[PDB]
Description:
2 copies of one chain form a homodimer.
Chain A: E1 5-9, H1 12-25, E2 28-31, H2 50-56, E3 59-63, H3 71-76, E4 78-83, E5 91-92, H4 95-102, E6 106-112, E7 122-128, H5 136-160, E8 174-175, H6 177-184, E9 191-193, H7 194-203, E10 212-215, E11 221-230
Parallel strand pairs in A: 1-2, 1-3, 3-4, 5-8
Antiparallel strand pairs in A: 4-6, 6-7, 10-11
Helix pairs in contact in A: 1-5, 4-7
One uridine-5'-diphosphate (UDP) binds at residues 10, 63, 83, 93, 96, 135, 139, 205, 208, 210 of chain B.
PDB class: transferase
Keywords: niaid, ssgcid
Assembly: dimeric
Amino acid sequence: SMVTILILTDNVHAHALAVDLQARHGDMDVYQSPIGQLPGVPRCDVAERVAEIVERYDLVLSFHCKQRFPAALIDGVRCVNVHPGFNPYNRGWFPQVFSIIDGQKVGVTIHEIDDQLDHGPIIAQRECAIESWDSSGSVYARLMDIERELVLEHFDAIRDGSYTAKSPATEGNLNLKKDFEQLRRLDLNERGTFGHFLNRLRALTHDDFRNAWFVDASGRKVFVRVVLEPEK
Amino acid sequence: MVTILILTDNVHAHALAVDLQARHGDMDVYQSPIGQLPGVPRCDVAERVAEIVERYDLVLSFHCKQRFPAALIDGVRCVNVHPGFNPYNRGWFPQVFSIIDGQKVGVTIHEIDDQLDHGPIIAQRECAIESWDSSGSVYARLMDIERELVLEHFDAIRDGSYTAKSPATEGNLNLKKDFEQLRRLDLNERGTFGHFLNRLRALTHDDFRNAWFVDASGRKVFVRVVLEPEKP
Lengths: 232, 232
Ligand SMILES: O=c1ccn([C@@H]2O[C@H](COP(=O)(O)OP(=O)(O)O)[C@@H](O)[C@H]2O)c(=O)[nH]1
Ligand SMILES: O=c1ccn([C@@H]2O[C@H](COP(=O)(O)OP(=O)(O)O)[C@@H](O)[C@H]2O)c(=O)[nH]1
Ligand SMILES: [Cl-]
């Protein structure tokens, strides 16, 4: 416990996991970002507190981070992120949405932070299979389980720094919030295969979220989501 | 005064028949030899023609899918209630086919001749198909329309005092095989998004596992869609 850890996440599941990690480890603080929406969780404005953070902490561990860390922070203290995609494929926003569409792997990756988003030396990663009946929702739920097991399994090694991280072979691709937003509008005139349309719908089905929509002939907006059930 | 035989295998029509029995009273309610209503007696119409003609003044069927023997038609006045808008998508599950082809759907009360859902129309009422409708949601409305249309015209149907008009054209007829064919989704089929979306909503009826495909690993997967219009 000579290792003093700062945990940063705006994600509700990662936060719950951070709380368990706290019970287990002890010398550990949990914050969210200035724009995070977790109720009752204090906020570190990382961009301003670089000095405090470096002096005060031995390791900064973030979950699902979307902003880049300032170079000075990356230098002054060991920074690690947990991303719920399989780097370097579909880095950035909502990896399993884009993976359902393009067929690239999804999973959870624990990695050292550099100046680019979801980039740089990989500590560990597990792939998550995408079944033909999976929606974004069902995959995401599995990813959160994988994340919990992966992080818990490797916590000691992350804490102690007893790993050798390996950079991915290639740069992969990056998706941003705009990219998800563009997927949401369904163009009723677009041509494609049924499989293509079906993937589109399931990639945009996540429990109750009203993601996919079209505007009908009379100007009414209609929300679409899909239900896929494999036989017993 | 007028003794009615009601024939239906449909659960909603049966309930409606039970109410009509409470009103008119000189009326028996049966199902067919292959119907599945719990505890409802069965007329094997094909073999009881002489008895039916003798015993009854009107045979009123709901959602009939088998053709009446010519002997019965000539021997007693036969009227059918069909949950389609004759002559369009006569036969099986009209709104399923109507959602896909854009023809009108509704409820038609008509005289029975030698062909299925054919012969002089007594009364009919159209049901609008909204862009967010599924087969399930249309069908619920069809069952309400059927109730209202039948209660409105009951005395006249009972009386025999209506005018009836033959439809101008033959229309089209859909059979169980046709519905069965629709169910199989071909993931390589090309079309517009709107087309595919109509196909899925057409095959969505509450919990029915209608639409299906077989994935690469040989696993059968059922598909339904959930459409929700914004608050008007
Ligand atoms: O408007 C949204 C926001 C999120 N999600 C889904 O919910 C998951 C959780 O995203 P969240 O914003 O909770 O945080 P992240 O997973 O990016 O940390 C995402 O992967 C999306 O699949 C969605 O369907 N619509
Ligand atoms: O295997 C089935 C059977 C019925 N239905 C739906 O349920 C409605 C009523 O079916 P029913 O068997 O009661 O036939 P009906 O008496 O209306 O001809 C149909 O129009 C279909 O929309 C379905 O989707 N799949
Ligand atoms: Cl490795």
